[PDB]
Structures are given as structure tokens and as C-alpha cells.
């Protein structure tokens, strides 16, 4: 039981007709060949071998010389024993001993003739592996081909046969005349592909006699596929060539023979989470002393600051400056420090979200249309939120996230993107009416077109940098670093361009100077739950439960979905999960912060995923040609605390934030809206509605389902989304969380009634 | 020597528990399988077959009944005879005759249940072919598997076994007990893949016993590849399989055993061209009575109108309206009509080109700096061009185009694109400098920004609609039709948008009313070749030979490169070629029209290729999984004559052409400049300087040459291009065609002594 590294050496004249042994190929997991006219290693590929070479090898292996459990530790002795066994096996006469022995002892040469190559290659080779050398060559002083196979008792590192220091266990000799129409390079390639797979080398390990090696090659042959002699193009191999192998292998092997659970005790989930996460406390403050940790704070800081200022600008221009940039910054800083010191999943980034923005819009519209204070109703909403969070934590109910499937999540994401796009286009439509494009802040000449130019420029700069991040240019290290700084670069470039122009007027941000409210003449710092100016009605202190339930539904959905996605198993997350503590902390802080007139926050799934990806380390000991794998994720609660502190210390520099026009922020808004459409399995199904059935891909939800049924599924999803969008534009746009809550069981019951069970496993895969 | 069609029928069970034979796969060139749970044909692929099935088939064929030269034309009779010689071959007992006979006579069912699909499959199948039927099934009332093979004396159309009315020659029968360590579907696929290649089905006709079949299957086996049981991705199948089969097949077959020609008689090429092309004159006018010609006429009209008006706008804004849109249109119409009536290659579209524009502006700069008349020098330049064209055709010097390699052509194309981009950006900067963006046809408030908006909008629409032409949306017929009209659609949309705005001033075109010169104050219609206001110097008439050689070099290069590219063997052009006649006509009529103050024209390679691609017919009788091939090209001289007439009649709609701003034209200019950078290997190798060696493609100029030598080649090309640009930037820009043609001796002498012969065959491939 070991791992094998195989290398093929051939007898080829180097420069001055000296014989020389030259390396030609190398097998770790996949074959790599050396180009003859360039002398450099090619790309890895599947070792495809002919069938005549296999028969020639099988024919010649029967008459070969076999030596088992040899006791030599140097090439002299091994070669002498091999020659003696050859001459006593009636393969060569007693006159060719000297010439064959001379041919055996020569100088091996390699293309990369411990330097950098050995250090780099020893990483990709497994930790403790044993090596094989295949020596094949054409000899003009022989009559018939001769073969020898040896297995050493103890692994021995030979002097220079191999390019790297790996102990050698197996040797293969094949010398013969150029006649008999035999291709020795192909036979060597066949032997090296034989010795580089698990079954054959395991069978060769406990091999006692000659014919035990013929059974192994017979078993190798009845496990492979055969391709007929005809092909034209390259998309014909993307088909079953990879599916046929898996199906046949599964047939061979088949014929060859939690943090989400109701306990029953009150607050059981809290106790389990606290006793699972908190013991490993001092570790989270120690694994932060790494270069990667301090290189992730900057990008996370920018990615958390840009949406904060954008959403603050939109809220300030919409909420009559009751809540603006300063208040969002204070809420993000205050609630990002407490969570990262007490929460059980410090990889979540707490911030504002689109659904919360549209709910605030709807509640403001409700309050204005009925002449009620907007900041004293939020206090009672927060109180009821605190009560609701306590009650569901008390009776474990976080298992309800298991009932939310892809069907609802994709509708949610699509609606969020649509409202972002609508907001951006509404803003520019409104710009062109304040400043009409007539002849020679109500009549400025060059404002509307310059706003359009800024918005388009900041979009098109971030688009072609997200594109560049995914490309193949530059070193991979630097490409990843530069491609990680797209939005700040676009914002800085557009701000500099706008600052160069010193004649035209454009709207700017409204951040104030020092620790102050955005509207000091309107509100103070604490909102008394009895009425700022007029007394609050006594019938709304009780009837504020419904908006509390709706906002709780929104917060629960986003936070629990984020915690589900982050805690997947493919990501090596080992410390634990916070399904019950995170929700309690988030909702309690959201309820308390409403007393001071600050907004509610959520989990911010995309930012959390970005933060999780910037702390992963990829294993470098991966053989060429296989995909990279996650080594581990560095979990700690220092980077989140630092980001929360840094976001808070952005009011003291509010002088540099007043030079930023609103058009740049709305361009970044639209860029975030369009880019989020990727990754949801509803956008491509909607793309499939316009292509002919010949061009549909080979994804799992296409091969198993007829076209019309898939189109029916997509039509039902579109109908649900359109019904959700109709309610939002009316004067009763305080029920869309209820509409999603309705589309959950509607989905279950009705779509179970219509579609079969087999179809709802590919169209609605978990 | 014939073609074969194979269909696999498997004995299954339906919902009614009656057996029936059900079609499962189909072989024309590549396999297509029927999905079980969807009942539709999958995509074609290579028939990958396992190795155990081949051994099982060979083992079974060792004892079986062979029915050679059967003489019956019904399925009952052949079934009865097959059973009769099965029961006498000691394969099945005499008690199972009735059961096997009952099994054979059943009902065949296919998924496609004449018809439209029947007609389509008739088209896809070759003209005259024979059918093979493979009937494999598991039967519960036999002891051992049984196989029979027949060959009918005469091809017979069986009743309903085939989905297609194709005569049947062979049929295979294989019935055996269930669960006998055999996969009968896989054996059926093995037999059907055996029967669907040239060698096996060619050797099946000349068969006498089972020994011939065994020899044929042995010869089939040592021509295939074997894939070991290992794979992770699909990028690794691209390397081994396609490149390895070609090498093996070439080894098997290797070990298995003009218009450009000097004559000597003056005007020989003219005589040859006239005697070759002119006899097929009546066929050039009766071939236009096809539906595809009219759509081609419309498309080429829209493709040839826009560059004419754009170049006319640039020339008018640069030549002080001495030459404008009207003169461009008149010259284009006259030269097009004359060439289409008299030329030997009427697939060329004669029009203005970028290098001609550069030479015209350089000559204008030369004339202004010497206080000379710009319209009297052109008369003498044309007078010398006529004599130069006559002398070179008289000596048959048109073979000199054989010495122009990819080096010079790629340098030329890159320079043209660079000048287009520079022109567009210079005009944008000039527009911004004319109308600044200060506060409240010179000094207009919001003219500078509207021009930028219009130019960017038209460029982006033109780019994105060309992107959609290459996509996979809509029916292919409609996608091709819609995607041909990108530039007219962009121009129309931007013109409508600009027409909507009715308060801002933008520059427009300068089309005049009626057949008139653009500036009827300095020139008439006939230029006096003696001086209009002052006598022309005598020394300038003689010394006009120097500028008359550079323009000749430019015209010759463009026209002959276009005629070379068009007349390749891939495009099925059968009428002839016009190397020595089209050049004479073009240069003579360019020299003549210089007397009336009209510009010279050229061959317009891209427009000619577009006109050639719009008249070709794709073969529809091609097997699935095969690349389409050209059936023929409709060669006629009505399409070009109509386009030339239509372009000339664009003067009468000059009222509509005055509503078009210049920004839209400059956006189309920049789009044409950027989009031409494709197909140039210099651009591709310039991309590879920024890409790590790991990511370089598998093209022929990468695998066979080291990276540094490839980089040295690109550096030398860049140095030549930079030298040409620096020369054109100074006041000696009149002599850039001299330096452009000086890279032929450089390649022939200097680049030969640096790079070996092997390297200058993939880097400089013809
Ligand atoms: Cl987010
Ligand atoms: Cl062109």
C-alpha cells in the first residue's frame, strides 16, 4: 500500500552520437511529455495508448526474466544480476554480456539538468511515495527483444536515474533489435501507464511468480474503454466518454460485492451553541497573527464601506435626512463590534440590505399617508421584534429554515436585483426633469449629461475589471490582488475625473461634520416612546405587531440562509455554527438600536461569502492536472472587529466624503444590481426560453426533463414573481414577506400535485 | 464501395407488458442514443465501447450460424430459415422453434411515431445507402446465447423494421438467457459500431466463412486506442485523443505500402483572362433569378453606403470641402458600374480605403506647405498612374504578389486600425476644445457632452448587436438575418434619438441639393491640366512621377491581396480569376476620373469578403456531427451592378442625409477600426506577452517554437510598426508606402539569418 511515481527513460543520442539515456515522460497522476524540438514539458493529459503495443507487451512478458526480492543497493549489482538472469534464461547468448552490460551503465540526462525544480516537484509528489523507472531502447547488437522485471527488497535512492530524490523499488528493462516492426517507445508508454494505477501496482506488490503479472494485465484490460478509429472534432468527447467510464466503473463496483435538532428543553440550542463555540475562545485571538489576515482587512473594509455610503445616500435623499450616512455608519460600527465579540459565527458581515430598504420605503409611505411620526413607530416595532426573537429562541424554531428551498430563494434574489435596477433608472429619469436640456439647482446647463456620463463610466470601469479578474493575464498572484480592488478603483477614478472639472454643478453627499445627526433641527439622539411633538395614539402601541412580524420574517430569512450557505461542508469550517445565537443577537440589537433612531441590520450574504473566501488557503501539494482543494479556513474574530472599528472611524474624514457625487454611487448601485443575477438557477432557465432545444446544455435539469415541462415550471415562477411585483407598487406594499411565506406551502402542495417526484429533484435540487 | 446505415433494436417491455422491439440507437457517422425517461434523441458522440463486450462478442461468434447469400425478400421467410439452420447447428433444441419464431415476429416501435422528420432524415442520410438491423434481447426460455448473421443476395425494403425506407442488406440476431454475465445492450453497441466503419463493412461483403469475420474484427482491434480507468476533467481529453489517432493512422498508412505564370508574349495575362472568363458571359446574368440575390443586394447596399458617407464626411471636414460626400458617391457609382460590366471578378466591391485617405491628407499637407493647387497635381498623378498600369500589365508583373507574406499584411492592417482610432479620438478632443464646459457654432452650452453620448451609444449598440449574431439565441435563420443589419440599426436608432431632442445644436452632414459639387465657388466639374488661376510649374508635371508610384504601390497591394484571398480553393469559385484585368481596369479608371476632381478607389477586402459570404450555399445533406461544407457560390454580375446603381441614386435622398450628425458617423468609424483587429496573428502574439507560459494556447506557432524566440519575433514586428508610425508622424509622411514595402527585403534577408528554416514556417505560415 503506497503511491507510485513513474518516469520513462529512453536510449537516444544527445549531440555527438554518444548513446545516453534521456528522459521522455513522467507519470504522477497524468502523463506529461517532453517536446523533442523545444525541450520543455507539455501539458498534462490522459494517457491514451494503442492496442497493438499492449499485445506486444503481453506476448514478450511471457519469455521475460523475472527476479523477485533482489538484495542490491546500487546499479552495478542490479545490472550484473539482471544480465546473469538474462543469460541463464536463454534470451541472449554468452557473447553479448559485455555489450549489454556496457549499454546498461551510461549517463542519464534530464531536461531540467537541490535546485528550484527539485523543491517545486517534491511538493506535488505525495509525501511518502516510491518510484519506478522504465528503460526502453533499441539495440543493434541483439537478435530478439529481451525483458527483465525486478522488485527490490528495500527501497533505494539511486544515484542519478531520477530527476528527484525518491526511493526506487521497480525497474523495467526492454532491449531489442530495431526489426520485427515493434515500437519500443509505445511499449514503454504502455508499461508506464500500467504501473501508474492502483490495481496493477497493488497486484505487482504481492507478486510471487511470472504468470501472476499476466492476470494483473488481463484485469487491467477488462476495465477500460475502446475508441474506434474515427474522429473529427472536440465536442464529441465532452459526451459520454466521461459518462461511460463512470457508469461502467459503478457497475463494476456494484457487481463486485447536527446543530439543527429540537431537544425538548427550553433554550437548548443556545446552550449547545455556547458550549460548543466558547471553549475555543483564545484560539480566535491567536490565529489572527498571519500575513493573510492583515491583507484581508483592507478589501473587506472597502467592500463594507461602499454599500454603506450608497444606501445612506439613498436613504438620506428619500427619508428627508431623518436617517443618513452618519446613522448607517454608527449602526454598522456599533453592531459589528458586539457581534464579533459574542457571536458564534464571526465570519458574518452585518449590514443593510435591499429588502430592508424597500420595507423602510413602504413604512415611510404608510406613515406619511396617515399623518404619523416615522421615528416613534420604529421604537415599538423594535420592542415587538425583541419579544418575538426571545419567544422563538425559547421554543427552538430555527429548524424552519429547512423548509425554504431554491424555489423561494431565487424569487427573492430576482426581486432584489429588479428593485435595484428600478431605483437607479428612476434617479436618472428624475435628474433630467430638474435640469431640462433647454437652451441658454433648477436650471443648470451641463448637469444632466454629466451625471449620465459619470454613472455610465463608473459602471463600465467595474464591469471590465470583474471581467479581468477572471481572465488569464499576468501572474496569478498579482491578477488576484488587482482583480480584488475593482469598485474602489472605479470610484476613485470617477471622483478624480469629476474633481478635474471645475465649472459644472453636481450633487454631492450629505455627510455632516463631527458626531452629529443629519438633521439636527428635526431629531435629537433618543426617541421617547410617547411622542416627540404630538402624543402617540394608544391604538398603535398594540397594533404594531404586524410590521414587526413582517420585518422579523425578512431578517430571519436572510440571516438563516446566509448561515446555512456559509456552514456547508465543502468549506472546511471546523469550530462550529451559530444557528441559534446569531439570530438572537442580531434581532435583539436591531430592536434596541431603534430606540436611538438607527436602522436594523441583517447578515449580508454576499459580503459574508466574500469574507469567507479571503481567508481560505489552497493546498499546494496537488498533482498537476487535478483541481485544487481547500486546505483549511482561518477562523478568528479579529478581522471582523477591525473592519467594524475602521468603518466607524469614517466620520472624522467626512470632509473627503463630501467631494463624492451621487452619480458615481448610483452607478455602483446598478453594477451591484446587475452582477447579482449570476449564480441563480432561474436566470439560465429564462435564457433557455429563447434558444432552440438543440442548443440546451447538458445540465442535470435539462437531460431528465422534457422541454415543455421545464418551460411550464419557469412560467409558474415568472407568474409568482410578477404577482409579487404587482403588490409592491400599490398602496398596500406591506405584505410581500407574507407573499413569500405564502409561496412556500403553495409550492409544496401544488407543485407536488402537478409535477412528479422524479422531476422535482433536478428542477429543485437542494 | 458503398455507404451503410445502422439501427439498434432492443427487445424491451412496454406499459401493457407486451414485448415489442424498441429502437435505442442510430449510427450514420456518429452515435445518437434515445433517452429512456424523455424519449428523445440525444446529441451525437463518439461510440465509446468497453473491452469485455468485444471479448464476449468474439467468444459468441466462434460458434454461430452464418447465412451467406440468402435469396428471400420477406422477414417471415428469413426468420424461418434462420431458425431452421439454428436448430441444426446444435445451438437450440427442437422444442424451442415455436417460441423463437414467435419472438422474432413482433411489432417494432420507434420514437418518431411521409413526415417532416422523415424528410429531414432522408436528407441527412447519404444519397444511396444500405441498412443494417441489429436485434439484441434477453430471452428467458433459452439455455445458452445464440447468434446469427445473414447477407441477402438482393437489397430488400423490409416492411416496418426501419424508421426510414432504406433497403436492408445485413441483419444481426442475438438472443440469450437473462443474467448470464453478459450485457446485451453493450454487445449490440459493439456490433453496431463494428458495422459502421469502412474497413469492417467493406470486408463483410467479401466474406465466405466465420474466419473472414474473425480476421476483420482482429484487424479492427489493432487500430483503436485504449483509455485507462482514470479521469477528472474534460480539458485533458482535448490533447491525447485527437492528436494521437492522427499520428497512429498516418503511421499505419505510411507503413502499409495557374493565372500567375510568366508567358513571354506581351499582354499574355490579359489574353488568358479574357479567353477564360468572357465565354461564360450569358451565365453571369441568368444566375441572378434566385431569392438569395435580393437579400444580398440589400445587405451589401447597406454595408457599402455607410463607409462612403463616413469617409466623405472626414474628407470634407479635412479638405475644406473640395471633395465631399457627393464626389465620393459619384465616383463609387461610376467605377462600380464600369467594373461590374467589364471586370473579370465581379465579386469585388470597389470603394475608398483608409491608406488612401492618409495619402490624400498627406498630399494636401504637402501642397499647402508649398502653396500649390491640390486639384491640379492629382490630374498629373493620374496621368502617370495610367502609364504605370499599362507598363506593368504589358510585362506581366502581377506575379510579384507571391512575395508578400503575412509579415507585411499584418503590419499594414495594424497600422490602418491605429489610424482609425487616432482619427476618432482627435475629433472628439477637438469638439471638446471648440465648446468648453464653462458656465452660462462656437461656445454652445451642452454640445460637447451630447456628441460624446451619441458616439458612445452608437459604438456600443453596434458592438453588442454583432456579439448577438455569434450567439445561440432564436432560430438560426432569423438570427443570421437580424445580425446582418447591426450598423444600419445603430445608425437609425441614434438618428431617431437625436431627432427627439429639439433644443441643442450638433454638427450635421454637408450633402448638397441636386447634382452639384460640394464647394461651387473654387471649382467646377472639369479641372484644367494647365493651372486654374496661375500657370502650373513645368518642373512639377515631370516630378509628379514620385507621388504616382507610392499610390500605385498602395492600390496594387490592396487589390492583389483581396484577389488572392477571394480566389482560394476553399471557396468553390469555378468561373475563373482576374489577376491581370481587374488591376488594369481599376488603375486606368482611377487615373481617368482624377481629371474631373474625383478620388481613386481600391478593392475593399472586407466588403468583398462580406459580399462573397452572402452568396454562398451551404450543403444541407451532411450527417449530424459533421461540419458544414460549401456546396457552391453563385457567381454573377447583377448583384454588384444593382448595388452600384443604388449607391449612385443616394443623391436624390440628400434631404434625409442632412439630419445625420457627425458623432454617429465617428462612432461607426471607431467600431470599424476596433473590430478589424481580429484574424491578425500579430495581435494574438501581442496578447501572449502578458500571459504566463502555462496558459498559452495549442496553436502551431506555440508548440514548435520556444517562448523567447516567439517574443523576439513580436518585438521586431513592433519595432517596424513603431518606425512606420514615427515616419508618418513627421512632415515627410508622403513616403510611408516606400517604407511599408521595404519589409519584404528585410524578411527575405535579415530575418532568414536570425531564425532557422523550421521556425519561419509556423510563425510565418502562408
Ligand atoms: Cl451583500
Ligand atoms: Cl473594407
From Swiss-Prot, chains A, B:
Residues 293-766 are annotated as: Membrane (anion exchange). GO terms for biological process: amelogenesis; bicarbonate transport; digestive tract development; monoatomic anion transport; negative regulation of CD8-positive, alpha-beta T cell differentiation; negative regulation of CD8-positive, alpha-beta T cell proliferation; osteoclast differentiation; positive regulation of enamel mineralization. It catalyses: hydrogencarbonate(in) + chloride(out) = hydrogencarbonate(out) + chloride(in). GO terms for molecular function: chloride:bicarbonate antiporter activity; enzyme binding; monoatomic anion transmembrane transporter activity; solute:inorganic anion antiporter activity. It comes from the Eukaryota. The chain crosses the membrane at residues 293-316, 322-359, 369-401, 411-432, 448-465, 481-501, 535-557, 583-606, 638-683, 710-746. One of its GO terms (cellular component) is apical plasma membrane. A lipid is attached at residue 720 (S-palmitoyl cysteine). Residues 466-480 are cytoplasmic. Keywords: Anion exchange, Antiport, Cell membrane, Glycoprotein, Ion transport, Lipoprotein, Membrane, Methylation, Osteopetrosis, Palmitate, Phosphoprotein, Transmembrane, Transmembrane helix, Transport. Belongs to the anion exchanger (TC 2.A.31) family. It is linked to Osteopetrosis, autosomal recessive 9: A form of osteopetrosis, a rare genetic disease characterized by abnormally dense bone, due to defective resorption of immature bone. Osteopetrosis occurs in two forms: a severe autosomal recessive form occurring in utero, infancy, or childhood, and a benign autosomal dominant form occurring in adolescence or adulthood. Recessive osteopetrosis commonly manifests in early infancy with macrocephaly, feeding difficulties, evolving blindness and deafness, bone marrow failure, severe anemia, and hepatosplenomegaly. Sodium-independent anion exchanger which mediates the electroneutral exchange of chloride for bicarbonate ions across the cell membrane. Plays an important role in osteoclast differentiation and function. Regulates bone resorption and calpain-dependent actin cytoskeleton organization in osteoclasts via anion exchange-dependent control of pH. Essential for intracellular pH regulation in CD8(+) T-cells upon CD3 stimulation, modulating CD8(+) T-cell responses. This is Anion exchange protein 2. The chain holds residues 320 to 1219 of 1241 of the full protein.
